Design a protein around this ligand. Structure first.
Ligand SMILES: [Mg+2]
Lengths: 30, 141, 163, 30, 30, 30
């Protein structure tokens, strides 16, 4: 998919969701 | 490893651990308890088998007892249970007393895997070769 | 011993260990103990063996007049005391580290590791060679590319962005 | 929109896209 | 050998492909 | 390109070839 798409979502996608999201991906691999 | 600090080796056989008449007040007198020489020894002695001589380091500081890291036995006493006579030399080179060969003493040199100055698994063969010739034993290699 | 003949000998051999040699280390040995031999020869039991030698032949006039096996820049590599370390079989890797971590434990000076042959020059201990047959360092080297270097920057904001 | 379902399906963005996402993720943060 | 750039451009392979190419780059081992 | 092959041409290769490929990997991406 277009790089600009993952960003707009990984940057926008709230934070009440995001800080429970981007952190979850940090709790799955590595 | 370092160098010197405390260690000796004066025994007869694992068959009778921590003896009194043979050694007694001679088995240790520097930081070694005569009665405490039957706890850390038989903790691994009676763990494999008793009979063969077992000397060992005597790492002593000032913390009550002592710590001895044991290893391998004398490859010379292996001629009373695994070769022949109950003795050894007696009558050295005045007559061809005993005789071992290439076959025997093989798995005797094999056991000492952490006690051999010869990475060459073949070179560490002629080392015990003499250990079975210090009494008058010919070799049938 | 012997004369000019014994001389040449030690060299041609010791220097064929530099011609046919996989590697080369020059270590000055002030206060060299026998434990010293008890080490490179212990690290030879279950990790090396007889594929390595280290004859203290700073005989210089010997080990040096005897490198017409092509060992230039070694006149500079002939100062003071040294204990030539030469490899025949096996990789050139591990042998270097052995001294690198020996002398750093005290174990006699290391001549600041004046460097030696194979690449051919001066002093500056590198780590090219020892990183081999540990290619899991190329497993970890890919850094998951798309993923690990991801969960470190693309995913490091949150754990450090809500300021 | 989705979070982990598009991350599991993501799991791509070739190092080309990836490294560029990171780099262009710095054109907005850091 | 030296099929450099292309081999590397293969990162379009996507993450899982690499967890594969790394599994294989050792597996049947430790 | 097939991964199976992209691995064969690397696994039991020779160490010197690989280093000239690790560092050159550290300049491309990342
Ligand atoms: Mg001389």
């Amino acid at each position: 998919s277009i790089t600009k798409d993952q960003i707009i979502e990984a940057v926008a996608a709230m934070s009440v969701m995001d800080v429970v999201e981007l952190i979850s991906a940090m709790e799955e691999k590595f | 490893a370092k160098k010197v600090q405390a260690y000796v080796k004066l025994q007869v056989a694992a068959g009778m651990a921590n003896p009194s008449p043979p050694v007694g007040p001679a088995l240790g007198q520097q930081g070694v308890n005569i009665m405490e020489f039957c706890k850390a020894f038989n903790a691994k002695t009676d763990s494999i088998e008793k009979g063969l001589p077992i000397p060992v380091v005597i790492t002593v500081y000032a913390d009550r007892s002592f710590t001895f890291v044991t290893k391998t036995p004398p490859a010379a006493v292996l001629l009373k249970k695994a070769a022949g006579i109950k003795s050894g030399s007696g009558k050295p080179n005045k007559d061809k007393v005993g005789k071992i060969s290439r076959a025997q003493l093989q798995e005797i040199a094999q056991t000492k895997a952490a006690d051999m100055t010869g990475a060459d698994i073949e070179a560490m063969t002629r080392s015990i070769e003499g250990t079975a010739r210090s009494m008058g034993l010919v070799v049938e290699d | 011993m012997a004369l000019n003949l014994q001389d040449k000998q030690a060299i041609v051999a010791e220097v064929s260990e530099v011609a046919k040699g996989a590697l080369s280390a020059v270590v000055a040995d002030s206060r060299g103990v026998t434990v010293d031999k008890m080490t490179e020869l212990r690290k030879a039991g279950r990790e090396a063996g007889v594929y390595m030698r280290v004859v203290r032949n700073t005989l210089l006039r010997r080990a040096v007049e005897g490198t017409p096996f092509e060992c230039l820049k070694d006149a500079f590599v002939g100062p003071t005391l040294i204990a030539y370390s030469m490899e025949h079989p096996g990789a050139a890797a591990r042998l270097f580290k052995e001294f690198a971590k020996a002398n750093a434990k005290f174990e006699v000076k290391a001549a600041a590791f004046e460097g030696e042959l194979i690449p051919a020059s001066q002093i500056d201990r590198l780590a090219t060679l020892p990183t081999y047959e540990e290619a899991i360092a190329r497993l970890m080297a890919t850094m998951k590319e798309a993923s690990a270097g991801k969960l470190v920057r693309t995913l490091a904001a949150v754990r450090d962005a809500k300021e």
